[PDB]
Amino acid sequence: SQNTGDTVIIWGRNKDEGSLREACDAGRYTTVIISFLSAFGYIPGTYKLDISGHQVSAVGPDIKYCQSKGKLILLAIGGQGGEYSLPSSQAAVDLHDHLWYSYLGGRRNGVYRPFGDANVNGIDFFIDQGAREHYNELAKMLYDHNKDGVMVTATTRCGYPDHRLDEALATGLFHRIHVKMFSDGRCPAWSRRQSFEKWAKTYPQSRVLIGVVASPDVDKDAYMPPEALNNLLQFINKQPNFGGVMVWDRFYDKKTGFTAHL
């Protein structure tokens, strides 16, 4: 197909999409983004993982299985709700420590790890809501584990710049950027190519992926059928840092077969 890069699937938004291991056994994806750690910052010590009623006890064994099959697993922070922001630098430190000891490679007895002894491979900054401040500091704190892996990625709205992420991206620490064509802030169809290329050329050291929906039931205006996405990909895959396609989401990708038809 014209997707020369990774295929990244969002998982966690509907329990009826099946387990994480099922997504990894589908033969379709290189990376799964578990979505979302959806509450933090507004209340000290309050953090919520919203994976739509998926059983957390199944996730850890499935992460280890997925990684044994060569898949990368990221946890997305943020999401589309209104229960998260970083109101201070201390909020960023607190969220760092929560992520490191609850989900990443850190260990501290007494900390609840929803996925047990499994480690996610990194954190996606899906900062679609709330205020912009202090994510640059969180990115530095997460990245610093690589200096003494933690992949640091972001998922942005369609138009460049995304003011919720621009300061964090300016740190230069983001390995991947997933540019949503869909959701609030969606580009008008005529501008998708130029918008994506602006993102790609602005961040030449990152792999830059195009985010699409698997069904017009998710976003009717932003949906591109496989044939139309391949027409767009034949242009944007010429960017040297084109990174692949991110698809919202596993439930709808199963429903339509989108990635299997690309």
Author numbering: 6 to 153, 159 to 272
Structure paper excerpt:
Plants have evolved xylanase inhibitor proteins as part of their defense mechanisms against phytopathogens. The rice xylanase inhibitor protein (OsXIP) is structurally similar to GH18 chitinase and homologous to wheat XIP-type inhibitor (XIP-I), which inhibits both GH10 and GH11 xylanases. Various inhibition and interaction analyses showed that OsXIP competitively inhibits the hydrolytic activity of GH11 xylanase RXyn2, but not the activity of GH10 xylanase RXyn1 from Rhizopus oryzae. Although XIP-type inhibitors share significant sequence similarity with GH18 chitinases and adopt a (β/α)8-barrel fold, they are thought to be devoid of chitinase activity because of lack of the catalytic DxDxE motif, which is completely conserved in the catalytic domains of GH18 chitinases.
The OsXIP structure was refined to Rwork/Rfree of 16.6%/17.9% at a resolution of 1.30 Å and shown to adopt a (β/α)8-barrel fold, as observed in family GH18 chitinase structures. Electron density maps of the amino acid residues (Arg155-Val158) consisting of a part of the loop between α4 and β5 (Lα4β5OsXIP) were unobservable in the structure. Although OsXIP shares only 38.2% and 27.6% sequence identity, respectively, with XIP-I and hevamine, a GH18 chitinase from rubber tree Hevea brasiliensis, the main chain structure of OsXIP was closely similar to those of XIP-I and hevamine with RMSDs of 0.85 and 0.77 Å for the corresponding 260 and 253 Cα atoms, respectively. However, in the OsXIP structure, these amino acid residues were substituted, that is, Gln9→Arg18, Asn34→Ser43, Asn45→Asp55, Gly81→Gln85, Ile82→Gly86, Asp125→Phe131, Glu127→Asp133, Tyr183→Phe192, Ala224→Val228, and Trp255→Trp258, respectively, and the substitutions appeared to have caused the protein to lose binding ability of allosamidin. In most GH18 chitinases, three disulfide bonds (SS1, SS2, and SS3) are conserved; however, only the two disulfide bonds corresponding to SS1 and SS3 of hevamine are formed in the structure of OsXIP. In particular, the loop between α4 and β5 extruded from the opposite side of the DxDxE catalytic site in hevamine (Lα4β5hev, magenta) consisting of only four amino acid residues (Gly148-Val151), while the corresponding loop in OsXIP (Lα4β5OsXIP) was made of eight amino acid residues (Asp153-Val160) (brown). Although OsXIP possessed Arg155 at the corresponding position, electron density maps of the residues making up a part of Lα4β5OsXIP (Arg155-Val158) were not observed, indicating Lα4β5OsXIP being more conformationally flexible than Lα4β5XIP-I. Furthermore XIP-I has Lys234 in helix α7 (light green), which forms a salt bridge with the acid-base catalyst Glu131 and water-mediated hydrogen bond with the nucleophile Glu239 of XLNC, a GH10 xylanase from A. nidulans, to inhibit its catalytic activity.
